Amino acid sequence: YPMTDHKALAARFPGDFLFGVATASFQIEGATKVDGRKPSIWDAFCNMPGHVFGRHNGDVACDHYNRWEDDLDLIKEMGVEAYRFSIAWPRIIPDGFGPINEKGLDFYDRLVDGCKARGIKTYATLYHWDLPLTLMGDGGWASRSTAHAFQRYAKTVMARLGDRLDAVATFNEPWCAVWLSHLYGIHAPGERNMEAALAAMHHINLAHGFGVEASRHVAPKVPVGLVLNAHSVIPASNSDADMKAAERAFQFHNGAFFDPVFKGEYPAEMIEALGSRMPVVEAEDLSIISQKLDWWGLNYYTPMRVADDATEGAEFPATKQAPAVSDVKTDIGWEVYAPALHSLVETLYERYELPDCYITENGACYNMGVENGEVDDQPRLDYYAEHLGIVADLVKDGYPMRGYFAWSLMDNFEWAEGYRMRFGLVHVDYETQVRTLKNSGKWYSALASGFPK
Amino acid sequence: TDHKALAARFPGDFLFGVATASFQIEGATKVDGRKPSIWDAFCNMPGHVFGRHNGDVACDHYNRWEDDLDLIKEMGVEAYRFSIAWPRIIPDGFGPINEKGLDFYDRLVDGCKARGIKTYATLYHWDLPLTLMGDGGWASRSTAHAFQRYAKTVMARLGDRLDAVATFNEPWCAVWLSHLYGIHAPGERNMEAALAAMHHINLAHGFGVEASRHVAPKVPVGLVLNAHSVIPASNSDADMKAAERAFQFHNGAFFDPVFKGEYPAEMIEALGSRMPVVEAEDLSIISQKLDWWGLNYYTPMRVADDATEGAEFPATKQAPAVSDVKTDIGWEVYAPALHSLVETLYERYELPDCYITENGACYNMGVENGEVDDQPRLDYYAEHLGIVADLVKDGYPMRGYFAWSLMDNFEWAEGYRMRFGLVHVDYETQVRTLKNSGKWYSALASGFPKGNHGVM
Numbered sequence: 074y075p076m077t078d079h080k081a082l083a084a085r086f087p088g089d090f091l092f093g094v095a096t097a098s099f100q101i102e103g104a105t106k107v108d109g110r111k112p113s114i115w116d117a118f119c120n121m122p123g124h125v126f127g128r129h130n131g132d133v134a135c136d137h138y139n140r141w142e143d144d145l146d147l148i149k150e151m152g153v154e155a156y157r158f159s160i161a162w163p164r165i166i167p168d169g170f171g172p173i174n175e176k177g178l179d180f181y182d183r184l185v186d187g188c189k190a191r192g193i194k195t196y197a198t199l200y201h202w203d204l205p206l207t208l209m210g211d212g213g214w215a216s217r218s219t220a221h222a223f224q225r226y227a228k229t230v231m232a233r234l235g236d237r238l239d240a241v242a243t244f245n246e247p248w249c250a251v252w253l254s255h256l257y258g259i260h261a262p263g264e265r266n267m268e269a270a271l272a273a274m275h276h277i278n279l280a281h282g283f284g285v286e287a288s289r290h291v292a293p294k295v296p297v298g299l300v301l302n303a304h305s306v307i308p309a310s311n312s313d314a315d316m317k318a319a320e321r322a323f324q325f326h327n328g329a330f331f332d333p334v335f336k337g338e339y340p341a342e343m344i345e346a347l348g349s350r351m352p353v354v355e356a357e358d359l360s361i362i363s364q365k366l367d368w369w370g371l372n373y374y375t376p377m378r379v380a381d382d383a384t385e386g387a388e389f390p391a392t393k394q395a396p397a398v399s400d401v402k403t404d405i406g407w408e409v410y411a412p413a414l415h416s417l418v419e420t421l422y423e424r425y426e427l428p429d430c431y432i433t434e435n436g437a438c439y440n441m442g443v444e445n446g447e448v449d450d451q452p453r454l455d456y457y458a459e460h461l462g463i464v465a466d467l468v469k470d471g472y473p474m475r476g477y478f479a480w481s482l483m484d485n486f487e488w489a490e491g492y493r494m495r496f497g498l499v500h501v502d503y504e505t506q507v508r509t510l511k512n513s514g515k516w517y518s519a520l521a522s523g524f525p526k
Numbered sequence: 527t528d529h530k531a532l533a534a535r536f537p538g539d540f541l542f543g544v545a546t547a548s549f550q551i552e553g554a555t556k557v558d559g560r561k562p563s564i565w566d567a568f569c570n571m572p573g574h575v576f577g578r579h580n581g582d583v584a585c586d587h588y589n590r591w592e593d594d595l596d597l598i599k600e601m602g603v604e605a606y607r608f609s610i611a612w613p614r615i616i617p618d619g620f621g622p623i624n625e626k627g628l629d630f631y632d633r634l635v636d637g638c639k640a641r642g643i644k645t646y647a648t649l650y651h652w653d654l655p656l657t658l659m660g661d662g663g664w665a666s667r668s669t670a671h672a673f674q675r676y677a678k679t680v681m682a683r684l685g686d687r688l689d690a691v692a693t694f695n696e697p698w699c700a701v702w703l704s705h706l707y708g709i710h711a712p713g714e715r716n717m718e719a720a721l722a723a724m725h726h727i728n729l730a731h732g733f734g735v736e737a738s739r740h741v742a743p744k745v746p747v748g749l750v751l752n753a754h755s756v757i758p759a760s761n762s763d764a765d766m767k768a769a770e771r772a773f774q775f776h777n778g779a780f781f782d783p784v785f786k787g788e789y790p791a792e793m794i795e796a797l798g799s800r801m802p803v804v805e806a807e808d809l810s811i812i813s814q815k816l817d818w819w820g821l822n823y824y825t826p827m828r829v830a831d832d833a834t835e836g837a838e839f840p841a842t843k844q845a846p847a848v849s850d851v852k853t854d855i856g857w858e859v860y861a862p863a864l865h866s867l868v869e870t871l872y873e874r875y876e877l878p879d880c881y882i883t884e885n886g887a888c889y890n891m892g893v894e895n896g897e898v899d900d901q902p903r904l905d906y907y908a909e910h911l912g913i914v915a916d917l918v919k920d921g922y923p924m925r926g927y928f929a930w931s932l933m934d935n936f937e938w939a940e941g942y943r944m945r946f947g948l949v950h951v952d953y954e955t956q957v958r959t960l961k962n963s964g965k966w967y968s969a970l971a972s973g974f975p976k977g978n979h980g981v982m
């Protein structure tokens with residue numbers, strides 16, 4: 074049972090708690106070929122049949138590149154203190170390496186100015202998956218040179234925006250950019266090769282480290298973070314095999330990123346099984362990867378239930394999907410189970426020395442539209458109540474949970490799922506570009522408005 | 527293999543050549559304005575190419591081309607078949623023309639002229655500018671129009687000197703091998719993408735023919751196809767219907783539109799709903815008349831019916847080899863499949879003059895004694911040229927023959943491991959060594975053109 078009474082729920086949060094809404098550049102911007110933007114690997118992935126539902130693409134999206142003032146006005150009306158957004162590398166350095174696109178920088182310059190004027194805090198993500206297509210020539214993330222391209226891109230953005238940005242994250246979800254994109258073939262560039270994935274793994278960890286150094290060198294005032302979909306790993310049974318399975322799944326899906334960044338090492342059992350196939354790790358890599366961060370971002374939606382897979386010749390971590398425990402599912406099919414969020418954060422703060430935590434993404438897919446000038450999305454409202462409940466519990470128990478960004482300000486391009494899957498607090502009619510604040514959004518606004526106190 | 531007796535089986539004006547492709551030999555992948563091709567991306571992402579081999583070095587031809595031309599001249603080979611790198615000419619696919627790129631081929635073509643070497647250029651031999659992948663590569667119709675402009679750009683500069691041009695080399699590879707089987711760049715395995723690539727390459731061929739004739743009307747225009755010699759596993763009804771389905775899919779998909787102005791009926795029945803839009807004028811554009819056509823032949827395609835539930839058209843599976851002779855890449859040697867193939871094609875379609883634009887064999891032996899003993903290559907050539915001479919005697923319009931690899935080179939997904947050259951290349955020293963097969967081929971080709979002399 075949720076609870077949902079906002080006035081009560083609001084009492085459970087400290088006065089300086091940060092409430093936000095989140096978007097990503099490719100998902101909402103459109104204007105793919107204007108002001109010097111060159112193609113990203115997602116433009117390619119969309120336009121090649123077989124990868125994205127309906128062959129949907131980012132050409133128009135929410136037209137946010139043009140309508141951004143309205144959107145910031147909306148965040149202002151909702152009384153949301155913070156906006157988490159991503160910056161398009163294809164706009165800043167269209168070829169990945171090469172000339173800087175001054176018009177690219179100009180746009181986010183204005184965007185940040187726009188937020189500053191409205192008293193909206195800025196949480197920027199440098200990389201939320203739109204890698205300049207040209208970088209695939211050298212091998213993309215499988216090439217170490219791509220990390221150096223990112224390095225220069227980060228130093229460029231932070232030099233321009235560092236005097237106003239409230240916070241910066243290097244990467245959004247290495248798990249997706251790494252395994253889902255290079256091992257499972259589901260996200261761009263759509264590869265299914267362990268050697269390629271391991272290369273991407275290390276080079277993205279490396280690029281993060283280069284990114285930290287770059288930010289601090291040109292904008293040392295801005296708190297630097299990293300955003301991770303750490304998976305709440307839950308065994309199917311308490312059998313010895315399933316417990317061991319959950320630990321391996323943890324090392325592979327979480328440790329591959331958390332241990333290098335926060336412990337300056339890769340997980341030992343993972344190295345045993347997969348080490349021989351990694352690219353060169355240079356003497357100074359791990360110490361660069363493991364620089365101290367001022368904050369970190371957690372993205373969470375649903376647990377990762379695993380069982381052992383004893384199949385002959387199963388690759389590490391040799392696990393398979395266990396069935397859902399809750400009956401409740403979102404429209405995209407993900408199990409709804411709030412307490413996995415609690416145990417996830419506990420495990421992480423026991424296992425790693427972590428800085429302040431912001432819940433950088435939390436939300437649900439529910440595809441109801443506009444009937445009677447209102448969007449009736451009670452199951453989404455329920456979701457936020459139930460999960461914010463857990464976040465308040467974490468605050469009570471002493472964890473340094475400093476903020477929460479509701480995932481998806483508005484409906485947008487949902488990657489492989491195209492425009493089919495809505496995650497927004499605000500409905501978008503893609504034929505008129507009209508924004509309609511959903512009922513869940515009215516609720517979240519009623520909660521967020523009372524902060525700061 | 528007596529080369530004198532074999533030489534006599536050919537007409538005096540028969541054309542002997544050696545063949546090459548831009549990405550396989552050139553190197554200099556980042557020089558003079560060249561942007562990446564889909565094959566640079568393909569090579570450099572682990573899992574696609576043996577050893578992760580790439581085209582960066584290759585045979586360093588971009589730097590050593592005059593020496594390689596002198597080599598062709600010294601061999602006595604009259605013709606040179608090569609491809610032009612689109613990534614050097616219009617590096618983003620669309621976008622600004624790169625003059626440095628054009629100059630290189632301009633100077634190459636001048637070098638062929640000065641040496642008396644006839645030029646048979648291939649506009650597209652698989653090196654698509656990576657940027658075009660932004661719109662969906664060959665799955666986007668726009669890519670055909672980019673080619674069209676590329677085609678026109680090249681022929682405007684080179685058309686006053688080129689002896690001949692082919693639009694595309696092997697639609698089958700660029701279409702099915704690249705978009706359905708995932709073996710070649712860009713490495714897709716999707717029928718919808720492959721069908722889009724199929725029509726868009728056919729269409730691009732047509733645009734190319736018109737573009738070339740618009741700016742260089744005198745230049746003979748062709749298309750190079752690895753037409754598959756489809757042989758059934760048995761004469762069973764199921765196997766023979768399968769061979770015909772296979773012919774339609776692997777050959778008909780390209781031969782029918784180009785030479786009959788229609789797609790194969792049964793194939794349209796199984797797959798047409800998943801094809802891209804065929805605009806009103808498309809098929810007439812595709813089926814413009816050609817002055818010649820190139821056949822690439824290596825080995826037969828033996829097939830059997832596959833009754834597996836839901837097996838997609840053409841619903842066939844590989845059948846086993848009849849000969850037990852195989853090249854080092856694993857391809858059956860079976861020369862008579864060349865004869866039956868050519869005769870099938872000429873009965874089935876109305877075709878212009880034929881050149882064998884590729885024929886050769888993978889054998890990986892290297893330099894020992896300062897010499898390369900590649901008898902199986904030589905044996906392969908003598909036997910296949912015999913077949914070509916049989917086709918001549920039977921009255922088939924066989925005008926010329928190009929040996930498959932002037933030199934060992936980057937062999938696509940196989941990297942540098944699989945050698946096809948008449949000339950051995952040591953990739954550390956870049957030293958060219960003429961193999962024994964090369965000596966033999968030079969001996970044969972040197973007698974042509976036979977020239978005006980008496981008889982008795």
Ligand SMILES: OC[C@H]1O[C@H](O)[C@H](O)[C@@H](O)[C@@H]1O
Nearest residue numbers: 097245246302372434480487
């Ligand atoms: O549904 C997935 C949503 O959460 C993901 O973790 C991504 O960070 C976000 O872009 C996406 O839309």
Ligand SMILES: OC[C@H]1O[C@H](O)[C@H](O)[C@@H](O)[C@@H]1O
Nearest residue numbers: 547550695696752822884937
């Ligand atoms: O092995 C295949 C060889 O034949 C194919 O016909 C190609 O056109 C050539 O580039 C390749 O090297």
